[PDB]
């Protein structure tokens, strides 16, 4: 019966859960991440730098390791919070790893995959797919992993500037 991201609650990088009703009212970019992939320096600078343009006008990003593909992302929370941290300069929010695939997948992403149907087939195929949350906690889109954080900007810009 679940209606909006706001719904799930989530344990984040620091071992502290929040619900996502944190978030009503803003613009959600939600990415699983990895930091052992060749494209996790592009898509996390380009995430930073979104952040910063946009996190003022209303977006949030929320990064969510997993470890679900080519075990990417072997490291505890810890570790991937420095090495984000003092590579990128991570400003946007952190989550401790989660499953995206699979039974045992988080309910958030068991939701988000509800909404939204990948190419082909709708299980999250690589490291760092993306999902966009409008004002009202409605999944409405869905981005392969190679799609550019930069390429999802001019979607987000319609979502903010609705109420
Ligand atoms: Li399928």
């Not at 592009?42 to 006008?57: A, D, F, S």
């Not at 082909?120 to 981005?143: A, C, E, M």
Request: glycine fraction near 8%.
């Amino acid at each position: 019966s679940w209606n909006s991201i706001y719904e799930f609650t989530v344990k984040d990088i620091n071992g502290v859960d929040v619900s996502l009703e944190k978030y009503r009212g803003h613009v959600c970019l939600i990415v699983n991440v990895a930091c052992k992939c060749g494209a996790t320096d592009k898509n996390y600078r380009q995430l930073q730098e979104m952040h910063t343009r946009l996190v003022g006008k209303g977006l949030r990003i929320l990064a969510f390791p997993c470890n679900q593909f080519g075990g990417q992302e072997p490291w505890a929370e810890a570790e991937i919070k420095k090495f984000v941290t003092e590579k990128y300069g991570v400003q946007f929010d952190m989550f401790s790893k989660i499953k995206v695939n699979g039974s045992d997948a988080d309910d958030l992403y068991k939701f988000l995959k509800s909404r939204q149907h990948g190419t082909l087939t709708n299980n999250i195929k690589w490291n760092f797919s993306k999902f966009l949350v409008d004002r009202q906690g409605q999944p409405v889109k869905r981005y392969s992993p190679t799609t550019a954080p930069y390429d999802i900007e001019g979607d987000i810009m319609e979502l903010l500037e609705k109420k």
